[PDB]
Amino acid sequence: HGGYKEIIAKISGDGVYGRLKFESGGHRVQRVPATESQGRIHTSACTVAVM
Amino acid sequence: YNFPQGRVTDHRINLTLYRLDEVMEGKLDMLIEPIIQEHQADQLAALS
Amino acid sequence: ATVNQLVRKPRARKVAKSNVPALEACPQKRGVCTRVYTTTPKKPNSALRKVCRVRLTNGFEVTSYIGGEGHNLQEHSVILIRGGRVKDLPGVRYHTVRGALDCSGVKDRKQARSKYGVKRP
Amino acid sequence: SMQDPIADMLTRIRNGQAANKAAVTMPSSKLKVAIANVLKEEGFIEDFKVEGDTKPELELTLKYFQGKAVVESIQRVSRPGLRIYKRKDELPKVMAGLGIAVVSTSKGVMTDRAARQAGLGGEIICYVA
RNA sequence: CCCGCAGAAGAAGCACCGGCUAACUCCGUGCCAGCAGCCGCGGUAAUACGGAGGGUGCAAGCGUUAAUCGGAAUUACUGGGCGUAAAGCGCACGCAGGCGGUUUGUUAAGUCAGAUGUGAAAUCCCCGGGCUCAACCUGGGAACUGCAUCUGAUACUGGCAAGCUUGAGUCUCGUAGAGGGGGGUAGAAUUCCAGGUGUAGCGGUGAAAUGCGUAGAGAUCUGGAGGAAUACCGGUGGCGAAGGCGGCCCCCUGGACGAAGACUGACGCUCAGGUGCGAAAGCGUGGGGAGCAAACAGGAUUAGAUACCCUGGUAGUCCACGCCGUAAACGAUGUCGACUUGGAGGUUGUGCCGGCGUGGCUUCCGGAGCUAACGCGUUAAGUCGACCGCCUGGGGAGUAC
RNA sequence: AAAUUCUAAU
Ligand SMILES: [Mg+2]
Ligand SMILES: [Mg+2]
Ligand SMILES: [Mg+2]
Ligand SMILES: [Mg+2]
Ligand SMILES: [Mg+2]
Ligand SMILES: [Mg+2]
Ligand SMILES: [Mg+2]
Ligand SMILES: [Mg+2]
Ligand SMILES: [Mg+2]
Ligand SMILES: [Mg+2]
Ligand SMILES: [Mg+2]
Ligand SMILES: [Mg+2]
Ligand SMILES: [Mg+2]
Ligand SMILES: [Mg+2]
Ligand SMILES: [Mg+2]
Ligand SMILES: [Mg+2]
Ligand SMILES: [Mg+2]
Ligand SMILES: [Mg+2]
Ligand SMILES: [Mg+2]
Ligand SMILES: [Mg+2]
Ligand SMILES: [Mg+2]
Ligand SMILES: [Mg+2]
Ligand SMILES: [Mg+2]
Ligand SMILES: [Mg+2]
Ligand SMILES: [Mg+2]
Ligand SMILES: [Mg+2]
Ligand SMILES: [Mg+2]
Ligand SMILES: [Mg+2]
Ligand SMILES: [Mg+2]
Ligand SMILES: [Mg+2]
Ligand SMILES: [Mg+2]
Ligand SMILES: [Mg+2]
Ligand SMILES: [Mg+2]
Ligand SMILES: [Mg+2]
Ligand SMILES: [Mg+2]
Ligand SMILES: [Mg+2]
Ligand SMILES: [Mg+2]
Ligand SMILES: [Mg+2]
Ligand SMILES: [Mg+2]
Ligand SMILES: [Mg+2]
Ligand SMILES: [Mg+2]
Numbered sequence: 001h002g003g004y005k006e007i008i009a010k011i012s013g014d015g016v017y018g019r020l021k022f023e024s025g026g027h028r029v030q031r032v033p034a035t036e037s038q039g040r041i042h043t044s045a046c047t048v049a050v051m
Numbered sequence: 052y053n054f055p056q057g058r059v060t061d062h063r064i065n066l067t068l069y070r071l072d073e074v075m076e077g078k079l080d081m082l083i084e085p086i087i088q089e090h091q092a093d094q095l096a097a098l099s
Numbered sequence: 100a101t102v103n104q105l106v107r108k109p110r111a112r113k114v115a116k117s118n119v120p121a122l123e124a125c126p127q128k129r130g131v132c133t134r135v136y137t138t139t140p141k142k143p144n145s146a147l148r149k150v151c152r153v154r155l156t157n158g159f160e161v162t163s164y165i166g167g168e169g170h171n172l173q174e175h176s177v178i179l180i181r182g183g184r185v186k187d188l189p190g191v192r193y194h195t196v197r198g199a200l201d202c203s204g205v206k207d208r209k210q211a212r213s214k215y216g217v218k219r220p
Numbered sequence: 221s222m223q224d225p226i227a228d229m230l231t232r233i234r235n236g237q238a239a240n241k242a243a244v245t246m247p248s249s250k251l252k253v254a255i256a257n258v259l260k261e262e263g264f265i266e267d268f269k270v271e272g273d274t275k276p277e278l279e280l281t282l283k284y285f286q287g288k289a290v291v292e293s294i295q296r297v298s299r300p301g302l303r304i305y306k307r308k309d310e311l312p313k314v315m316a317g318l319g320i321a322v323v324s325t326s327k328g329v330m331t332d333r334a335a336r337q338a339g340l341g342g343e344i345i346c347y348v349a
Numbered sequence: 350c351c352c353g354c355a356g357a358a359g360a361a362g363c364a365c366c367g368g369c370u371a372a373c374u375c376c377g378u379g380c381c382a383g384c385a386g387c388c389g390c391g392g393u394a395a396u397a398c399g400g401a402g403g404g405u406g407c408a409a410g411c412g413u414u415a416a417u418c419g420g421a422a423u424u425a426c427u428g429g430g431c432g433u434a435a436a437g438c439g440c441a442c443g444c445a446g447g448c449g450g451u452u453u454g455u456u457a458a459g460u461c462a463g464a465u466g467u468g469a470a471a472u473c474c475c476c477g478g479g480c481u482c483a484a485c486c487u488g489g490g491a492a493c494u495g496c497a498u499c500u501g502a503u504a505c506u507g508g509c510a511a512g513c514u515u516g517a518g519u520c521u522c523g524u525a526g527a528g529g530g531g532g533g534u535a536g537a538a539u540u541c542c543a544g545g546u547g548u549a550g551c552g553g554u555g556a557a558a559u560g561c562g563u564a565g566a567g568a569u570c571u572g573g574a575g576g577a578a579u580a581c582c583g584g585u586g587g588c589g590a591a592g593g594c595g596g597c598c599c600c601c602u603g604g605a606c607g608a609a610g611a612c613u614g615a616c617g618c619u620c621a622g623g624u625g626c627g628a629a630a631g632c633g634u635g636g637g638g639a640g641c642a643a644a645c646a647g648g649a650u651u652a653g654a655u656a657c658c659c660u661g662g663u664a665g666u667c668c669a670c671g672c673c674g675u676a677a678a679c680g681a682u683g684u685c686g687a688c689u690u691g692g693a694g695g696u697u698g699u700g701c702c703g704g705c706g707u708g709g710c711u712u713c714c715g716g717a718g719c720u721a722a723c724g725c726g727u728u729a730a731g732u733c734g735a736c737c738g739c740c741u742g743g744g745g746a747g748u749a750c
Numbered sequence: 751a752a753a754u755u756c757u758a759a760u
Contacts, residue, residue: 022086030392031054033758040759041055043380043392056393062381101736102302102426103447107621110424113741119415126415143759145380145392168382168399181414186385194414209400213363213412221618221686222516223449224734228687231733235689238717238732244688247515249451251505275515276451300448301735302426303506305460326461326502341461343505 001035020050064089119182119192121159127196130155130163132176140187148188151195153178163193167205167215176201225249227296230346236282237289248278254329255345256280258322262331264291264348294348297321307341319349 011020030043052059052071059074060067064085068074074082122128130153137147149165151172164185165172172178172195179199184192198204198216205215212219222228229252236244246252248270256268256278266281283290298304306312306323311332314321321332325342335342 019083022083022090027052029052029054030759031052035756036758037756038760041392042759044758053393058393100424100430100739101447103736104738105426107446110426112424117416122415124416126413143380144390146383147381148383166384183386183414186387186389196414207399211364211412219362221449221735223618223686225450225687227734232688235732239689241689246688247450254504274513296733298505299734300506303459305505307461324504326504328504330504339462340502343460345505 017050023048024050061086118184121155121157121161121193122182123157127179127181128155128157129177129179129200130161132172132174132178135172135174138188141189144187148185150188150191151178153180155180161193162191163195164188164191165195165202167197167208169206171203172201178202224296224300226251226255226345227299229255230294230296233280233282233291234294236280237291240284241282243279243281245277245279248276251329252278254324255322258329258331259348262320292349294346296346297344304344305341306344308336308339311335311341312344312347314347314349319347322346322348 026045026047028043028045030041032039033042033044036042052074054071056069057071058067058069059071059082061082066085068081070078070081132151132153134152135149136151137149140146140148149170151163151165152160153163154160161180163178163180177200179196179202180193181196182192183194185194195202196216197214202216204212204217208215208217225247229246232244232246235241253268253270256265259265259280260268264283266283268278268280270276270278311323312321313332322345323330323332323335323342324345325335325338325340327338327340329345330338
């Protein structure tokens with residue numbers, strides 16, 4: 001429907017890992033989804049790794 | 052990320068903010084500055 | 100059933116098996132913890148329940164629930180377990196007695212202290 | 221097959237009462253006559269009569285008081301598949317004594333009060349109330 | 350045990366407050382931390398989590414855990430069910446076993462009544478007594494529902510002897526029927542083989558294509574071969590224990606019913622284990638093979654099509670013998686017997702004068718009654734009796750050993 | 751004559 005089941009990208013620059021290394025783990029989102037007939041609020045999660 | 056309330060909360064350092072829209076447009080620096088502030092504060096302590 | 104059909108073969112009562120078979124008709128048992136971990140409940144509940152795996156003195160290997168808020172248990176701690184189950188956890192049917200051998204009572208507790216091994220201040 | 225005459229008599233009486241018949245006819249015997257005599261003496265039926273010489277017939281005349289059955293219930297107790305004998309101290313009371321229970325003692329067929337006044341037990345034929 | 354001294358002086362906790370279940374507000378957190386016997390609470394305005402105030406129940410105790418009975422009529426002797434919620438064996442015969450129409454006489458085994466012996470003490474229950482009361486101790490009784498012996502009663506059950514005819518069976522005459530086993534024969538049609546006429550299509554589909562045809566098809570006419578099934582009659586019509594049985598004819602053979610009379614004299618009903626029959630598919634041996642058609646091949650449709658549709662097509666379907674033993678084998682309703690308002694039909698016998706009756710099987714509606722309701726309703730799922738089979742939450746599973 | 755699907759908080 002929308003975004004990605006799994007997107008992996010390579011970031012090149014200075015001090016990239018010194019700033020982005022705290023983004024690993026899980027991120028939770030609570031909202032009214034676009035794929036919802038009713039107005040029900042739903043909770044979902046995404047998983048992020050930095051290498 | 053709570054969209055109905057427009058809030059973003061971080062559970063590692065227990066910090067909540069009401070600037071979700073600025074975060075989702077790419078200004079997440081204010082989220083990662085405090086964490087490092089805590090993190091580095093432990094690097095000098097672990098000298099024993 | 101006809102009286103003759105009952106004379107030939109009487110009524111048979113159900114076995115009525117027990118749901119705490121590791122205690123063997125005892126109120127409490129002593130065991131050693133071999134692993135301490137956290138699991139997740141069934142639908143619709145959501146949490147991080149605190150459980151442990153314990154080997155008893157009669158040769159059994161069971162899973163116990165650690166109630167309260169905050170515990171000091173780690174591996175190789177002798178604990179005292181009792182009957183009673185946790186509803187939304189799959190396969191947990193024993194409880195850990197707080198205030199027992201090597202598990203301290205919940206701190207800062209002020210109500211229902213006797214159920215958590217807390218002395219009266 | 222035909223293995224119990226007494227509850228056949230009882231069922232005929234019951235079905236006659238339920239269907240508002242004026243009289244019920246059946247083949248006869250001696251125990252049937254004794255039970256009918258007890259019923260007539262205790263005010264449950266009007267009269268009875270046996271007739272014939274080779275194949276006797278027993279006929280009972282049923283009664284209704286306020287346009288309804290007098291025999292509210294009549295049931296068998298001691299059946300061929302299970303017999304019931306009671307001592308003189310264990311004789312039953314039907315409807316706390318309002319109804320009657322027919323017994324057969326060594327002196328003949330009678331009620332439970334007549335059996336207690338004779339100090340006897342016997343076989344419990346039926347409960348009629 | 351009693352008396353004197355001083356002073357309220359030495360002495361209250363535990364669980365619970367959403368419903369079941371007696372007893373509510375504020376703050377903190379925000380599907381986190383946590384609660385929980387079952388429903389279930391917590392997602393930023395929680396009487397359900399943690400704390401505080403208040404309140405409720407017990408009280409030198411209060412809660413939790415373990416174990417037993419109850420509630421549970423949820424193994425139903427007292428005191429349950431089986432058409433559709435779990436539950437009637439696919440059907441039948443039948444040994445052991447359970448049950449038994451009617452009358453007379455005898456017996457006293459079951460049964461009933463009385464008496465005697467025993468049923469240890471303690472325990473439970475009742476009237477008293479002693480510890481200041483109670484717990485506790487103790488006097489007398491009642492009870493210990495049981496067993497054995499002796500004497501009596503004969504209504505019911507059982508034994509023995511003699512009976513009786515209504516249950517059950519035999520005989521005389523007849524009626525109807527796709528009931529079963531064996532053999533023969535007839536007609537229509539499809540297929541194949543040979544020949545005559547005749548010429549460009551046929552077949553199939555929603556539309557097409559594969560396929561057959563100028564080597565003469567399809568159409569049409571004549572003769573022959575072979576196999577399988579029997580149009581019309583034909584009908585909620587008939588026969589059979591069930592599974593099932595359909596052209597005509599002969600031989601062998603089982604049961605049902607009807608009218609009058611005669612005969613035996615309870616010879617009866619049900620049935621665990623046992624035995625026998627039991628659609629279709631399937632298996633072995635030997636035949637047979639027209640039509641149809643699992644598998645298989647090709648042509649289509651489709652995003653795909655190991656399918657539905659089209660063209661072919663092998664086991665099988667058929668016969669003889671032998672296994673298999675299963676079906677939504679269903680009326681989802683075990684067999685036997687008695688009783689209880691009516692109406693409209695079908696089929697098959699018989700008596701009296703088209704009318705009047707009287708038996709067997711069968712279809713539809715409906716009254717009381719019964720049922721959770723739907724519905725059943727003299728062919729009961731109504732009221733009773735005898736015997737058998739079966740059920741005890743849903744998955745796992747009619748599965749593993 | 752054709753024609754597949756609709757997760758997870760009311
Ligand atoms: Mg209340
Ligand atoms: Mg609580
Ligand atoms: Mg709040
Ligand atoms: Mg019970
Ligand atoms: Mg119980
Ligand atoms: Mg019963
Ligand atoms: Mg029941
Ligand atoms: Mg059923
Ligand atoms: Mg049947
Ligand atoms: Mg017999
Ligand atoms: Mg006998
Ligand atoms: Mg005797
Ligand atoms: Mg006696
Ligand atoms: Mg005693
Ligand atoms: Mg006799
Ligand atoms: Mg015939
Ligand atoms: Mg025939
Ligand atoms: Mg030709
Ligand atoms: Mg028939
Ligand atoms: Mg015959
Ligand atoms: Mg015949
Ligand atoms: Mg004779
Ligand atoms: Mg039989
Ligand atoms: Mg059998
Ligand atoms: Mg076959
Ligand atoms: Mg075959
Ligand atoms: Mg074969
Ligand atoms: Mg063959
Ligand atoms: Mg074909
Ligand atoms: Mg194909
Ligand atoms: Mg079966
Ligand atoms: Mg059938
Ligand atoms: Mg069945
Ligand atoms: Mg009947
Ligand atoms: Mg009807
Ligand atoms: Mg019913
Ligand atoms: Mg019936
Ligand atoms: Mg019936
Ligand atoms: Mg098997
Ligand atoms: Mg899909
Ligand atoms: Mg949905």
